[model samples]
Every structure is written in structure tokens, then in C-alpha cells.
Target chain A: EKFLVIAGPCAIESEELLLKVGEEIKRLSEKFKEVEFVFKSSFDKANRSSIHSFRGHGLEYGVKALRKVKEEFGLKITTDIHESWQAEPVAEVADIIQIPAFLCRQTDLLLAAAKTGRAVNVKKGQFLAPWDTKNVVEKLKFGGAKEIYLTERGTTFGYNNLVVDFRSLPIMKQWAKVIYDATHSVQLPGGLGDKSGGMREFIFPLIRAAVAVGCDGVFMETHPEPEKALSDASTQLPLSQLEGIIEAILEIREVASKYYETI
Target chain B: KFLVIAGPCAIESEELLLKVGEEIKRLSEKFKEVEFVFKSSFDKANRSSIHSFRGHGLEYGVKALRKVKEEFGLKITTDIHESWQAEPVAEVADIIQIPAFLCRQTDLLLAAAKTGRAVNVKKGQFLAPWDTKNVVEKLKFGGAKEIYLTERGTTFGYNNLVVDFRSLPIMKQWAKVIYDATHSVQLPGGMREFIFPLIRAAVAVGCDGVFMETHPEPEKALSDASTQLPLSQLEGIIEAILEIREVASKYYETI
Candidate 1:
């Protein structure tokens, strides 16, 4: 059961808060030694619905802070990059570089991430078919990246809602490590007038479904104070709730992995 | 008011079209309120595999559809693959359908719209249900007054589809929504079955219509063999669907 749990604030907010979350997560990693934890936070969110929405702490400052968290906690780190320029700088500090879903198709961006020679985790776009990710993967591999992870966030259903078809988890696993983005999967894309709305209640059910279907990992965004979080305020779960969710996920993975092996 | 669009997926022969056409007309008479739109494709432009049969050419296909309308007096619908095929197909078809793969083609939507026929635009497998609002806008912009949206299925993983029942109510806000039961059931490179549960679920969820492909002998059919309903099985399937609709109607009205 090589289940990787990548959880953190949606974006880098402050150095004090980032360390607080990292320390708490590091404790959980030791408690549940079976699961591998990768701390994730974005330096810049270039795709916010409104230009006025918070992007993130600037890349230079954010990476320095993230580097501090990793050194302090002695943990692996990950963060998403929106453009080609951020790839090399982000690679220096992070173990895995993530490609945002909306930018998954940009050949230049994928090429830059691949050139860094770090593990590239590409999130499947909301408008793309699962089979089509092979093309995205090919582009990453073509650019010389060996380690690739395919993540399914959610597909666009209607105007503002995204639904996770559990089938995507297993299908993607055929090509690369599949991770389910549990928190963002519940995002009501543009459901709020100025920001996205979400049904956090469904996140657990979706995670359960993702594990049942099969996946190597699950990604979630959690913050110490979710309601007042700088970004993704509605979707980010409170940091205190992480332990219970991880326990349930590990239990489900234990049973599901056994069944997964029989088939 | 419920409507059903059912026929062989593609017109193979005049005799085959008339036989299926007559049978559906009888079923329409039995269920008085149910509007039946006879559907057959003139050409299958976007089959997953190229070796698969493309339908009989348009001239012959429309001629057979015209004969069915003349003999049975049933309104007809058939999908058009290209912009030019629109007027000719519209000449015979009561409704002009834009294929799912071509739903986003602006020229095709405008051609179907300019014909002044009731246009049925299948939501693209690659498109989000709400993103179809832009599709509906394109047709209306092209001068189409009456438009219908059809939900076949969204791409689940590779070679599979899952019908998000929520799409029914979501797309209904724009135009009338029809569930394409046969195509929705298709495993797309995998096995196919009759998908009765999906049809039942669609009706129960209150769709404006159900679209299905039926053949006299499914195995013998030239295209879409795995998913088509057998001609002999239509009566029993329709009876079951009507029964479920009856039970749901009462509950829905009370609520």
C-alpha cells in the first residue's frame, strides 16, 4: 500500500502559518509511518477566477519559506508552477513540481518542468478525457522527465460543478501513478459570484470512492483557519480535521488494496 | 409530455427502414401522448475505428426516410455529418440533428439552424453540460428558433462512459434535454448491452425524451451492432418504460 498523502494550504500565505501546518503534518507522518506525506502549496495561482483574488506569496519569498518548512520538519515538499519561468527555481526547493490543470496542455510549460528532471505531477484538465492524458504524459516524457504522476482533479459537469468519475483513478493508474485531488474535486468552479463555491461534505465520500476505485495517492488542501484562508476559502478543510480523514483513508486503502490485488 | 427518438442507428435499406418505421408508429398509437421521432443517421463520420461501416450515402438515406414519412405519416429525424448535408437531409427530416462530435462546429450548427427545422444538438462527449449553453447560443445566433439538447454520455476513463443523471436537470434549464440511451450504453471499444436501467433512470429523472438506436437484428446491423436494441424487443421495453413513467409521474406531481 504505497499511498502518498499530499496535503497543505491551497496557497502559501505566511511563513508562521506554513510552519505550523508543516509541523502538525510531520507529526502525523511519524504516527502513520505506512503513508508517505508530501507537503504541497502553490507560490502563485495564475488561474483565479477574478484578477482581484489572492494569487500567492511571490515565488522568491514563497520558495524560501517552503525551503524553511522542509528543513525545519525534515520533509519532502511539492508546489505547483503556472508558467515556464518558475519551473527551475521551484525545482531547486521542491521534490515534485506540479502542473496546474488549466495549464496541462501547454507544451512549453510541461517541457520546462520536465527539463528540471524532477518528478512531474500533471493534473488532468476538467475539459480533457482520461485517455487523452497519454498525450500530456508523452509531452512530459518527450521533454526528458522520467517520473510522471497523473492526477485527476475533476471534470467539468455543468456551469460551476465538477464530478469525479471514480473510473478515472484506475484508468490513469495504467500509465502512471494516479492521485485523486479530493478537495478540488468538490469545487463548484465559479459557483460563487467572485470566488468558487464548494461542498466540503462530499470530499470524504469522493476520497472513499477514489480509494475504492484505486489510486497511489490523494491530494487535499487544508488550512489552520479555512474560512479566513487567503485563497480557496470555501474549499480548504480546517487543518485539525486531517488526522481523522487520513485514518479512514488508510483503513479503506488496506481493504481496497487486498481486493485490488486479487483482480 | 414524453418524446422518444428511436430507429436503426443508420439507414441500411429502404425495406429495413420501413419495417422499423411501421413498428414504432404502432407503439406511438398505443401510447397516445408520447411523441415518436424516427431517427437514423445518413453517415457516421466519427466512428472510433475507421474500418467500421459508414452509412449508406446521403441521397439514398434521405430517400428512404422520405418514403417512411410518406407511408407512415411519422415525423422523422436523421443526423447530418457536414454543413452541406443539412438542407438535403432537412428536406426529408422533420428534425435536423447535429452529431455529438460535431456539436462544437459553428458552421454545422449555423447550417442546421438556417434550415429552419427543429435542431437537435447532441452535447459533445468532450464538452461539459453547462458549457453546452454556449452551443445553444450558437444555434440561436444562426437563426434557429426551436433547439433541443441531447446527452449521450461523458467520457469516464478510456473506452467507457458514465451517464451523470445530474446532467438531465442541468441542461434542461437551457433547452429540452434528451437522453441517448443506446449510444450512452456503448462501452466505446468495450462490450455493449441494452442499458435498460439507464433508460429507466433517464425517464424517472424527467428528461424531455429518450434517443435510442434499434435494429431488426442487432448482430447483423452494419454499424453500432453491440448497442442497438433488437426490433422484436421494442414493445416489452416501451411497456416497462411507460409503467415506470406512470409511477414516477404520480410521485413527482405530489411533491
Candidate 2:
């Protein structure tokens, strides 16, 4: 019935950047009071378009960083895991274990995360149909997960473009709690030739639309300086500018909840 | 270097087919560098709900398509589902098209290419951008002198479709790429709102041509009624894209 806010740097570039982002979100949490905040950052961008791109400071070092943020900031933690092996260690710090969009259908990965006993957030695959996600929720439940959240990043358009269909959030809500990814959904995958390019302007429109249309949460990648971010430089939200949108989001959700009954 | 493939989705009747063909041909004459090829499907082999209106069968379609060419004084194009249709389709169609669902069919690519007419293959909704490499190689090995690839929207969740502008540059490495603005905008049930901006985006992003299924009265059209652009907007889109080509050619990848 309540809304969750998952926000953090795209990658844990350094302890300072992580600390800076966590403190800022902590401040936002104190102000809003109604929306729950989960500090999120990726340890590895395992599926980057180029092999030469940064894959973060391995799993162990990143988890320690996340643990530090959780300890100091008193905020819940969330981060993505690529392989099944990383799930156990990641679950130690992650209040919710996340499955990357590309790897969502991997049976081993799904089973491993569900076995961790932490809440699981599985991103719907870009190529998958909305109705097809019934199998994903089924797999998570079959593997013994009591709580699951489905995230819609975007779907493949023609080549490099990804467009978010607002209907997906409501469609997915039938199976599990749903999240709308504001950052990655606007991405023009591999649009820049060497890396993926994105239209950051659409980020606010998509998330606000998703929140009003009925999603349980919102996911976004934020950095102090978005253009300088190591991964997904084109799409990450600027850390300083993040507060106002969450304010708008809370208001949108308040009005939306009253009209929740099916027509 | 720019090609425009515009017509109704199906050959519903003699006059309607001739109606769209006649208008586009007149519009084509004012073109600075674009080649207009009247396109309509003889058989919509793949359509929604199964009982939907698939066009006139092969025999009548070929006869009707030939009339548009003879009357309008313009070239024509049409797609084929079966391999046998390739030989006969090549008889009338200057460009023989391979539908997206059958894109991976090697023998179909071979049969279409064997006709020696230019082949335009629409990328499958389920296929990725890089995957077109195999389709291109298949056509080249079949001795096709000319080949083009069409980017009609990829499958987005369930009945939704979206156009990725990056596919234009990605597929352009092997052959001339055409953006099918009409079919790309279809949501399976369908939507016509994105047709204009999508056409502009495709051209600006480096597409070699534009494709659309347009009709005078789209609300009552026999097939794909919802997605086809109204015939009134055809000239405006054409004029706007030509201006974009003039500016974009100087800046994007060069002419």
C-alpha cells in the first residue's frame, strides 16, 4: 500500500561518493517520512556493451561499502547480482536482492536469490512480454521467496532504443509489487556507438507517470555529476536535483491510491 | 539515395489501389532525390486475430498491382510469404520484400534474391540489431545485386511496438536501410500518433528511405486501418523529411 524509493549512484565509484549519496538520501528521508528509501548501487556492470568498461571493485569490496552506508545512514540497502554465487554474499548487505534485466530468466540466478530469504527485485527482460512475467514470479515463489518485486526498465523498440509502456506497471502488479525504472528505461542502448546513450529528460515524465498509474516503487540511478559517472553517464540523475522529484512523487501517490479500484 | 515506399496495407479493390498509387506518383514527381515505389500487400499472411482481412490472393493481387504501375507510370513493390510467390512477384514488383516473421528463412531469402529483382527485408520484431548481419550475408550469397533492410518496430512487451533509432546506423553497414513508419507505429491493435516524428527521427538518424501504409479513409480501411497514416499527411511528411535530408546529409555521416 506504501511506496518505496530505490536511489543511488550507478556504480560504487568510491566510498566518498557512496557516503555523499547516502547522506543526501538520508536527509530526504527525514523530510518526506512517508516514502521508504533503499540505498542502491551496482557492484558490477556485468553486461556493458564494451568489455573495456568498468565492472566496479568486485563483489566483496562493494558489499563492504554498502554495509558501511547501511550502518552509518540507517537506510535499507539494495544492489544487483549477476551470478548465483554472488547472491549469498550480497544478501548479507542487500535488504532486497536484485536480478539484472538481462539475467532475470536465468533459473540458477533466480533460485539462488530466492534462497537468500531476502526480498528479491527482478527486472523484466527487455525482450519479454508483460504477461510472460507470470513465469518469473512463479519461479521466485516456487524457490521459496515470500516477497517479490518486478521492475520494468524498458523494452527493445527498433535497435538501440528502449521505451517504457506505462501499462506495464499496472499489468505487472497482478503478479507482484512493481517498480518503474526512471533511468534505464529512457536509455538508447548502444546509441553512442561505443556506449549506451540516454534521454535524461524523459526520466521525470516516466517515473511520475508510473507512480500515478500505480507502481509500488520507483528505481533511479543518481550521481553527484551525471556526465562524469563511470557507467551510464548519459542517464543517471544528478544527486542534488533528486529531492524535488521525490516530493512530487509522494503527492502523486497520495492522490493515486484513492482511485485504486478497478474500473 | 532516398526511397519512399507508400501505399495502403492491402489491395482492397481496384480503385482504392489506383487511388493511393496515383496521388503518391504525382507527389513523387516533385522529389529532389527520392524514388517513390507504390507498395501494397497481396496477401497479409500474418494478421491479428486470424479471421482478419488478409488481402486479395496471389493471382488477383498480381493483376491489381500491375494496374497501379501501368496507370501511374511508377515502379511498385510487394511482399511474399511462400517461395513460389517470389518468381511471380518478381514479375511485377521491382523490389521483392521478405516479411519480418520469415526473415530468418534461408530458402526464402534465396528464392527472393534469385528473382534478381532488388530485395527489401523487414527485420523481425523479435530479432536484435546485430542479428541482421546473417540476413545480409544470406542475401549476398544468393546473388542479389541490390538489397535493403526495413526497420519496422521490434516486439516491446505484449502487443506494443517501439522504434529504436540506433538500428538505422547499425543495419546501414551492410545495405540501404528503410524505416517503415506505418508498421512500426502499430501496437498490434494499433496507433497513428507516432508516424510523423518517427519518420523525421528515422531520416535524421541516417535511414536511406521511409515506408508507410497510407489511405484516404483509414477509419474504414479493409486492413491495418488503425495504423496507416491518413493520405492528407503524406505530402507534409514528404516535404518535411526532404528538408531534413538537405540539412542532415551535410552533417550526419555525409551523403
Candidate 3:
């Protein structure tokens, strides 16, 4: 793929919403045919900021919902699976099985996902170095995963703050496909008493920064009305901004691609 | 000061502890006025694993440590957090130290200060290098007579931390800077481990003394299971740090 846009709500709340956002994104994505669009949503947000927070619709409901979205909308799909057991079911529906950062080292999960023969997108743990993901890739490869995509979510900076070390994109590419998680990096977990806050205003600035530092793909969650969404709503972009953000990043990706060729 | 006290949480029996204390006492005598203090934990309040082992309570714990001091004629020190724990724990402790997580805690600082014991404050990993000055001011305002600053390390990314040696000189504006060589390089949180390089950089930068939580066998130890240095390696680490301190001190003396 020349460039890719990974977009979805953080959690699967209802079919109407998923189809609505999915149809909108699928329409918008037509302008950039070269871009691979993967629809994403968490069936269960296992690594929530706190235990009491909303986990997604249960797996039985979750995979079914995601599968319905895929069938009705006919979109390439991705979702995070927390444990080894969720791997097989999620893979049955998802074109890609995305692993949350916290469980990046779950050997069993890697093995099960690899067995599905679907593409695996393992996110870099916030605590880890860019180079450290080599060991993660090794785990997947050892488990027979032929296609793998690595993502840079964000790094822990002080408590509750997440900062993206842009250099991570280039460093992680030594192993597999690297995606810059544009929205999640700006999440301010525990910044609010019970909710996660975000610096949505700085998303464009950070996107430009990541592109300058050489990001291969852009990963984000978009909702029609972010504030009303249950999880990561504050951090997710409104559907209106998606076009502008994608255009801005694509322009930068163009220059970065040429720069890569010359180097 | 010729020597400083540092060790992992108290494990094994009183007999084994006294045996270890005796060995350090002999070493201190050879070094002379090294400020020898017996160090161990009577209580480990903040363990990563909820099911992991804790130590003997202050009753047997303090008495056993007091026995170690009595046998060696050494000054004793240990950590405490709550205000209620201050007087009781300090009754036997000559030097009362603050835990890194509770370094900024106002009530705990005041409580530790009022005991009239030497207070060794470890900088919190969450805090910036220079912010320890605020800690020192709080301790002084709390009526602390003697204050020692310790650099354990700062939050690097996730479970891992990195020590900026410049923090030693920066923190010196308040008190003598002591770098906990072993803990400074710890991958204390999960998903990461290994930290010795950051410790070497701390010594190369300059610190007055060192605080080391060493164990007879580090890999098998019960707490700080990853970061504690092996006791057998103490002499080597001590020797190397002394050399680094001597070189850095000599350079500073000229300026």
C-alpha cells in the first residue's frame, strides 16, 4: 500500500454508529484509493484506565457486531484482542488482530494469533524502547506470523502523560510495518478524576511532527461526536476533522516518501 | 563520611542478619569513621506483587535490628512512611529515611524530621531533578537538623528509569548527593528490566556517597527482586565508585 489510514471508534457501542461512521469513512477514503483503510473498534478494552470503566460489548456480542459491520459495509477490519482466547474469534472476523501494548509479551496470544494466518499488528509498550520491539517481532515470527505490523502508541512521561518519541517510527521499522498512533499518543489518562482527557488541538501539530520524523502509516480513532462517546471520546477526533487531518498527513507523507527514496 | 548504609529488605533470620552486620562492621573498622549504619527494612509497604512476602513487624523487626547494632556498635537506619510509624520506628533507628514514593508527602516529612534523626530523602522517580530542593526546604521547615539527598533514578518510560547524573550536582544545592548505584538503574516495574549503565553514568557525573541495596543472592531475593546487587559484588562496586568520586572531586577542587 502506498499509504494507509486506520480509523474507528475506540469501542463498539452500537451497529448504527459503526455503520454510520464506517460508511462516512469508506466514502471519504475513495478520494485516496491508494490508501488502505482498515476499520477498527475494541470488542473489549481490557487495558482500560481503571477497572470500573466500560469494557466494550462482551466478546460474544463484540465479534458478531464487528463481523456485521464488515459484512454490511464490506470494509477491511481490525480490533484489539486482550488474551490468548480472544485471538481465534477476533481473527475469524478481523483482517488484522491488533494486540494492546500491555499484553505485547503474552506468548500464548502471539502464537494463537499467528496460527490464524492473519496479519498481526502489535503495539509497542509505552515503557519499552523503539529497539526493544525486536524481541516482540521475534515472538510473532517464531509463532509463524508471516505478516506483521508494528505500531508506536506513546511513551510514559511522568504520571498520566503520554509522549510519542517520534524517532520510534524509524527505529521500529527495522522489524515490521510501523504506524504512528496519532490520537492515542495525546491521551492524558488519569488527568481527570474518572476519565481520560486529551490535547485534541495539538493533533495536527503532532501529525506533522511524526511525518517529519518518518511515520509509515497513521493510526487513529474517529467518532461522529467524540465527546458523547463512552471511551477515549475526549481523545478521538470528530468525523469532521478526519478529512483535514488525512490530507495534511498525506501531503507530509509525500515529501517523506521522496526523502526516503533519496536516502 | 567514610561509609553509608544500604541493603535489600530484611530477609533470613536475625542470626543471618547479625552475621552480615558483623562482616560490614569489620570492613568499616578497616576504612575508619566511614559513618557505618546498619540498614534493612522492617516493613516493605509498597511491593509490586500483592501476594509477595513482607517482613517481620516492628516488634521483632526493631529488636532484631537493634541486636545487629548492639553486636556491631553500629548506628542503625530504616525507612518509615506514616506519622504514627515515625517515633516507634525511630526509637531504635539512628537515621530515618523517607521512601521515594512518599518523598513529597508533607506530613511524613514533618514526622520524620521531628525525630531529631538524620533524614536521608530519596528523590521520587516522578519528580524532576531540581525539585528535590522543594523536598529539602520542606524537611528544613519541618525542623530537620541533618539532611542527605539520594538519587534513586527517575521515570524513564514504563517500568524502567534512567538517572541523569547532573541531578547529583543540581540536588547538591540542598545537601550531599548520594546516588543509590543499584536502584538508580532498576527496571522495577514489569515489561522491562536491567539498569547498571545509568548507575555508571551517575558516578561519572559526581555524587558524594552511594546508597546500595545489596543482597547475599540478588536473583533469588524476595523484594526489589530485579535491581538489588549481589553482596559479593559490593567490594567491586564500592571500589569503582570511590575511584569515580575521587576523580570528579579532584577536578572540582581545582575550579
Score every model by TM-score.
0.56, 0.56, 0.58
Fnat per candidate, as a fraction, reads: 0.02, 0.02, 0.11
What share of the reference contacts is kept in model 2? 0.02
By summed lDDT, the worst window of 10 consecutive residues in model 2 chain B runs over B246-255
Alpha carbon lDDT of each predicted model: 0.82, 0.84, 0.74
Question: How well is each residue in B149-235 modelled by candidate 2, as lDDT tens digits?
Answer: 999987866877766555666788888899898888777752565465456556545578899989999999988888888898888
> Candidate 1: where is the Cα deviation over 4 Å?
A261-263, B1-255
Each model's chain A TM-score? 0.97, 0.98, 0.95
Task: Give the clashing residue pairs of candidate 1, or none.
Answer: A158-B130
Give a tens-digit lDDT track for model 1, residues A178-223.
8989889888988898889987755665565566446789999999
lDDT string for model 3 (A80-157, tens) is 875566788888899989987755655656677888999999887665677768777887887789989898888769
lDDT for B85 in candidate 3 is: 78
Q: How large is the interface RMSD of candidate 3? A: 11.8
- Angstrom error of the Cα, residue A169, model 3: value is 1.5
Pairs of residues clashing in candidate 3: B2-B34, B3-B34, B185-B195
| Top-DockQ structure, candidate number | 3
lDDT of 1 by residue, B1-255 (tens): 688899998888899999999899899888887889999887888877889888778998989999999998899999888899898888988899998889999999999999999999988889877798999999899999888999888886678777665566668778988989788867776334325645665655557788888898999998888889998878876776665556444323110
Off by over 4 Å in 3: A261-263, B1-154, B157-184, B187-255
Docking class of 2: incorrect
Which of 2 and 3 is the better model by DockQ? Answer: 3
